[PDB]
């Protein structure tokens, strides 16, 4: 519903454009496959899953992306070096253009994932997730040797759940570090930093998450986004209220698909909308808020990159 | 995430406070009842309806509003002068404090309801919902005699589908030259002018609808809202895609509910969320954005009117 004065940078990773003024480029819906307790992953430690039944989940996002025009990016979660290596190996053989966040909670795996991506040549399509404030010295070493050029920087200021804390952990750095997390990325060889707001639980710093979306875009200009569905997933009241009603998912879904829409209208450029199995409910909701953003942009004077494949044209 | 410079006017209508800075007051949730093809309504012309399940649809919202903290207001919808009088008599006979919007498409019915509420004694509660450019001399002359001090000023320029067009019908006046609708209402007794942004359908004026929420609020200072769910219910593409999915409602509801959360974060003070049967899905979603709006209010400097009953403290 607004345009930004600070010239927004747009990063074209593997045919997907991250960044730009609100409405210039469509929102980049980032799915999540092989997450914790995925129904297709049989052997989580060894990375053994149902390869035939996973291509159907991906082809559901591919076909719905061609109707709405919303670009899609995978996020291959893994917890062991062997598992994430077989997950990455499968993904690049079924599709050859779409980027993938190599996400993991253990820095050893992201260390292993970074080496494998450059080993087999698919490194310009890999987004390292994420360069947070707890990154150790070993993780920098493997990242800078690797050929990964795009990475997600997590605007996490642990003892500062405020907008100024998120700015400070990227600008000056927080506690336990001396350089801003947006400059640690530069020395890691990341030419394409992509800020993550690090959404906080509801009632413990959730308002700063949504007010940092138009603040970390009008201050840095780099692509801004994150996983906002974690706010409704950590909500204790909803987890209790939704069980009383006959359909637990009928009530939780509008709230879970409402965190993205609220942040999208505030200027978010990509949405870690969670499990891949929610494709048919997030795309209609997100492409709607992209018609709203693609209308103000056409009226506020913002130029749209590809108007023919915008949700404001295909779906109107 | 906003804090308007223009001082926002708070109107108290039977305990439901309309307006204020984003986060100052909990979002009002107007709920349409007795609408077209309501299951309870059996004779749409003599206003028969169930009158037993009708309480069940109204007690549900009271209990939810006493769990979330969001104010609740009814919107009585009638098509004939006899039908609308039948609904007001029932509603005032079950609830004695909550206001209502006597809504109707025809002018002669709205005037009849506004005149009827004066004779019954409940007209400080009526929120008679039309002050539009398509108003005849008959309706303004009966609304002046009736003791209705609140009205929903609808900012609908048929000629100009822009945000400037919304301003001009309120301040200067368009089709129906001079005496803008915000200045017609003052001269027909309306003491509490509540602004409606007149949500235009998706693809034509749906961008000006969301950018008018922070525009008309920061220009006039009066409470801002509207029926944003009409943007999604009148979407042609969604109707086609929805009917192919196994569960048509589970695809549509996140989109329909998302029209309100998107406009709520912009600064909307009340939300016409549609049928009252959707009360279990809009309250959790709207209350989630009030926690988010109730935290930036305590960070930007806004003073929450009653912290002990805000969704930021009742929930979480």
């Amino acid at each position: 519903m607004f345009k930004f004065d600070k010239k927004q940078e747009v990063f074209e990773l593997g045919g997907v454009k991250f960044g730009g003024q609100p409405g210039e480029n469509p929102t980049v819906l980032v799915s999540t496959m092989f997450y914790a307790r995925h129904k297709i992953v049989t052997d989580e430690d060894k990375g053994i899953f149902d390869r035939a039944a996973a291509e159907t989940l991906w082809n559901t996002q591919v076909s719905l992306s061609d109707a709405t025009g919303l670009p899609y990016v995978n996020q291959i979660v893994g917890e062991t070096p062997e598992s994430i290596k077989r997950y990455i190996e499968w993904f690049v053989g079924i599709d050859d253009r779409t980027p993938f966040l190599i996400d993991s909670s253990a820095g050893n795996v992201r260390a292993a994932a970074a080496q494998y991506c450059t080993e087999i040549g698919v490194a310009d399509r890999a987004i390292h997730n994420s360069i947070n404030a707890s990154i150790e010295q070993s993780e920098i070493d493997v990242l800078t040797e690797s050929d990964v050029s795009a990475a997600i920087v997590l605007a996490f200021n642990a003892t500062d759940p405020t907008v100024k804390g998120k700015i400070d952990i990227l600008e000056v750095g927080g506690s336990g570090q001396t350089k801003g997390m947006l400059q640690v990325a530069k020395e890691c060889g990341i030419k394409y930093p992509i800020i993550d707001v690090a959404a906080m639980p509801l009632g413990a710093g959730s308002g700063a998450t949504i007010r940092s979306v138009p603040t970390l875009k009008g201050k840095f200009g780099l692509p801004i986004g994150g996983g906002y569905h974690n706010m409704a997933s950590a909500w204790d009241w909803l987890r209790k209220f939704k069980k009383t009603q006959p359909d637990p998912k009928a009530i939780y879904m509008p709230t879970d698909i409402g965190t993205n829409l609220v942040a999208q209208i505030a200027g978010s450029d990509y949405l870690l909308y969670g499990p891949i199995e929610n494709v048919n409910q997030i795309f209609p909701a997100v492409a709607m808020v992209d018609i709203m953003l693609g209308e103000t942009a056409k009226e506020l004077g913002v130029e749209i990159a590809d108007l023919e494949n915008h949700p404001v044209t295909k779906l109107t | 995430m906003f804090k308007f410079d223009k001082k926002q006017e708070v109107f108290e209508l039977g305990g439901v406070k309309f307006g204020g800075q984003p986060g100052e007051n909990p979002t009002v949730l107007v709920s349409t009842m007795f609408y077209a093809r309501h299951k309870i309504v059996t004779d749409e012309d003599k206003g028969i309806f169930d009158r037993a399940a009708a309480e069940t649809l109204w007690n549900t919202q009271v209990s939810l509003s006493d769990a979330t903290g969001l104010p609740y207001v009814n919107q009585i919808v009638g098509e004939t002068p006899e039908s609308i009088k039948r609904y007001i008599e029932w509603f005032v006979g079950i609830d004695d404090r909550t206001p209502f919007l006597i809504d109707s498409s025809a002018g002669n019915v709205r005037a009849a309801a506004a005149q009827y509420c004066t004779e019954i004694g409940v007209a400080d509660r009526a929120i008679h919902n039309s002050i539009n450019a398509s108003i005849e001399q008959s309706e303004i002359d009966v609304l002046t005699e009736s003791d209705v001090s609140a009205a929903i000023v609808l900012a609908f320029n048929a000629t100009d589908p822009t945000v400037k067009g919304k301003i001009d019908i309120l301040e200067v006046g368009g089709s129906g030259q001079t005496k803008g609708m915000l200045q017609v209402a003052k001269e027909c007794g309306i003491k509490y002018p509540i602004i409606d942004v007149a949500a235009m359908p998706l693809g034509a004026g749906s961008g000006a609808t969301i950018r008018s929420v922070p525009t008309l609020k920061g220009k006039f200072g009066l409470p801002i809202g509207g029926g944003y769910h009409n943007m999604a219910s009148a979407w042609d593409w969604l109707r086609k895609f929805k009917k192919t999915q196994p569960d048509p409602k589970a695809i549509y509801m996140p989109t329909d509910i998302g029209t309100n959360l998107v406009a709520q974060i912009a600064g909307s003070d009340y939300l016409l969320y549609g049928p009252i049967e959707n009360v279990n899905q809009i309250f959790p979603a709207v209350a989630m954005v009030d926690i988010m709006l109730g935290e930036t209010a305590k960070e930007l400097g806004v003073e929450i009117a009653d912290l002990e009953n805000h969704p930021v403290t009742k929930l979480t």
Partner: peptide, 27 residues
């Protein structure tokens, strides 16, 4: 015309007449 405040820290602010999200100049 409304200077809608969204970030007093970095001085960021909206501008409702133009729709821009600018930064209030102290000058």
């Amino acid at each position: 015309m409304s200077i809608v405040r969204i970030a007093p820290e970095i001085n960021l602010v909206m501008d409702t007449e133009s729709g821009t999200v600018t930064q209030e100049r102290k000058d």
